[PDB]
Design a protein around this motif. Structure first.
Motif, short mmCIF file in Angstrom:
data_model
loop_
_atom_site.label_atom_id
_atom_site.label_comp_id
_atom_site.label_asym_id
_atom_site.label_seq_id
_atom_site.Cartn_x
_atom_site.Cartn_y
_atom_site.Cartn_z
N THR A 130 0.82 -1.21 0.00
CA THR A 130 0.00 0.00 0.00
C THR A 130 0.86 1.27 0.00
N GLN B 192 -6.65 1.35 -0.21
CA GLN B 192 -6.19 0.35 -1.18
C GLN B 192 -6.65 0.68 -2.59
N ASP B 195 -3.35 1.29 -4.54
CA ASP B 195 -2.68 0.13 -5.12
C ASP B 195 -3.31 -0.15 -6.48
N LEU B 235 -3.14 3.28 7.71
CA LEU B 235 -3.60 2.33 6.70
C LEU B 235 -4.53 1.23 7.25
#
Lengths: 278, 240
Positions: A130, B192, B195, B235
């Motif tokens: 991430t 996410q 990503d 996160l």
């Protein structure tokens, strides 16, 4: 000077009292803390925890603004331990950096620390993945010259290249080895090479070994012991086709020989492997 | 002009191709009821019968891409309509009579049943709208509005219409999905999206303007906050 032992024992005694006068003033008004902190003009541990209990990330920035090495003190004093987001703005100093950096529109800066936190990252794979993604999206969105940008995204492309390895781990051996999908650690080249070759990895095909020979430049102990370990299970699985292919995928005095047998078509393929390399 | 081409089954390949073009103009204007009113005129069994020139392989792919896009707005508007129909708290009657006290003990107990289902129906409309947004964003076999066949004859209009549609609608679908994930408190997953986007597998980040990126980066920093308020790291991972 000399007889210092008595002069560093009287320090601990006045320092256990500016702590017993601070706690006492922890219930009281902190408007006086600023003057108690200045009177014994350091006793920072007290004025540093008054700035922490409130949203005055403005006070802990005003403290470090007028100080001699408080910065090296407020970081080692953080690790030992609305307007609250203005004190969050100052408390976001340290690893929470990138956050107040995106906020300040300091993208290039956010990219540097986002990559730095990606590197130290070892506890969680899903998280190391991430951070790079974020770092990358930070850098892309920033104002690097097309040259610098091309460097950040190339040195990056490398990171993504190693990671992709642990990423493509088959879904047969990861339920065999009873592994958590994402809640697993950042594995190293060895663990990977050894796990890509386990007798647990059943459907292991040309690509599983090719990638278990691509993760050798990701090392930093015995290189050519493994170079053998893997080419050998590359044959156990053959059940004397795959050795064939992996010699077709490489394009050679890497592989060993006599050391290997340590047999009818091993030498037989090692002949049209002296014609291939030539 | 679509019903004229649909009428004659021997021109279904041309009906689809032209249906695509027409729906490419409307998509760039976000006329989804326009695009869909055309999308139904295309018989549901067109694809089956037509079965391949480079112009027919792409138009079949484009058509499904377009359906994947539409379905990603049909399910969001339903989801969104619902998010704006939350059961309202019982009204309070300070200084209540003993009659009004009991009517309220019930209205307060009924509401504590509806709010549970409006999270119930929501979860199922969230699980569904999400899936669709990942079918478009992660379109199988070469990305959304991206030809798989590479031997057709030059069509700059279409080709540049397919690059544009990606730059108008992929930034816009991402920002929605972020709004869906944030609205339902799925903060770990919000992050996410960085990503998914940056991914070299899709190269979605090329479809973004530099400004849109930062905007997505100020959207994620917002999900992050709520994750701190919960006690986790930026996160979403436990602070050991």
């Amino acid at each position: 000077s000399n007889r210092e032992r008595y002069d560093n024992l009287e320090m601990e005694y006045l320092q256990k009292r500016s702590d017993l006068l601070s706690p006492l003033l922890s219930l009281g008004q902190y408007l006086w803390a600023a003057s108690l902190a200045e009177k014994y003009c350091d006793f920072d541990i007290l004025v540093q925890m008054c700035e922490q209990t409130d949203n005055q990330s403005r006070l802990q920035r005003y403290m470090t603004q007028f100080a001699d090495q408080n910065f090296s003190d407020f970081l080692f004093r953080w690790y030992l331990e609305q307007h609250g987001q203005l004190a969050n703005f100052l408390q976001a100093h340290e690893h929470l950096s990138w956050l107040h950096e995106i906020n300040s529109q300091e993208l290039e800066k956010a990219h540097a620390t986002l990559l730095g936190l990606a590197n130290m990252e070892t506890r969680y794979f899903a998280k190391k993945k991430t951070l790079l993604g974020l770092s990358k999206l930070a850098a892309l969105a920033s104002d690097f010259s097309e040259d610098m940008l091309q460097e950040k995204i190339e040195e990056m492309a490398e990171q993504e290249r190693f990671l992709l390895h642990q990423e493509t781990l088959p879904e047969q051996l990861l339920a065999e080895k009873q592994l958590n999908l994402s809640a697993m650690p950042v594995l190293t080249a060895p663990q990977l090479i050894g796990l890509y070759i386990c007798e647990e990895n059943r459907r292991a095909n040309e690509y599983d070994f090719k990638k278990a020979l691509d993760l050798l430049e990701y090392i930093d102990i015995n290189i050519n012991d493994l170079k053998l370990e893997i080419l050998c299970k590359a044959l156990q699985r053959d059940n004397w086709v795959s050795k064939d292919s992996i010699f077709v995928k490489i394009l050679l005095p890497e592989v060993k020989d006599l050391l290997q047998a340590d047999e009818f078509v091993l030498k037989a393929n090692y002949e049209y492997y002296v014609q291939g390399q030539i | 002009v679509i019903d004229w081409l649909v009428f004659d089954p021997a021109q279904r390949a041309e009906a689809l191709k032209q249906g695509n073009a027409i729906m490419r103009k409307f998509l760039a204007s976000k006329k989804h009821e326009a695009a869909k009113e055309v999308f139904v005129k295309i018989p549901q069994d067109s694809i089956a019968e037509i079965y391949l020139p480079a112009e027919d392989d792409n138009a079949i792919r484009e058509h499904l891409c377009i359906r994947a896009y539409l379905e990603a707005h049909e399910t969001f508007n339903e989801w969104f309509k619902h998010m704006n129909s939350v059961p309202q708290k019982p009204a309070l009657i300070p200084q209540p009579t003993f009659t009004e006290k009991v009517a309220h003990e019930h209205k307060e107990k009924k509401y504590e049943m509806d709010f549970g289902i409006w999270k119930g129906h929501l979860d199922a409309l969230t699980a569904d709208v999400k899936e669709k947004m990942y079918n478009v964003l992660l379109f199988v076999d070469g990305g959304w509005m991206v030809d798989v066949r590479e031997d057709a004859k030059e069509d700059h209009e279409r080709t540049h219409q397919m690059v544009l549609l990606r730059k108008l609608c992929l930034p816009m679908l991402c920002f929605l999905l972020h709004t869906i994930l944030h609205s339902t408190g799925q903060y770990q997953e919000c992050l996410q999206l960085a990503d998914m986007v940056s991914s070299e597998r899709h190269k979605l980040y090329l479809v973004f303007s530099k400004e849109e990126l930062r905007k997505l980066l100020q959207k994620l920093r917002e999900s992050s906050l709520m994750l701190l308020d919960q006690g986790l790291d930026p996160l979403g991972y436990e602070i050991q």
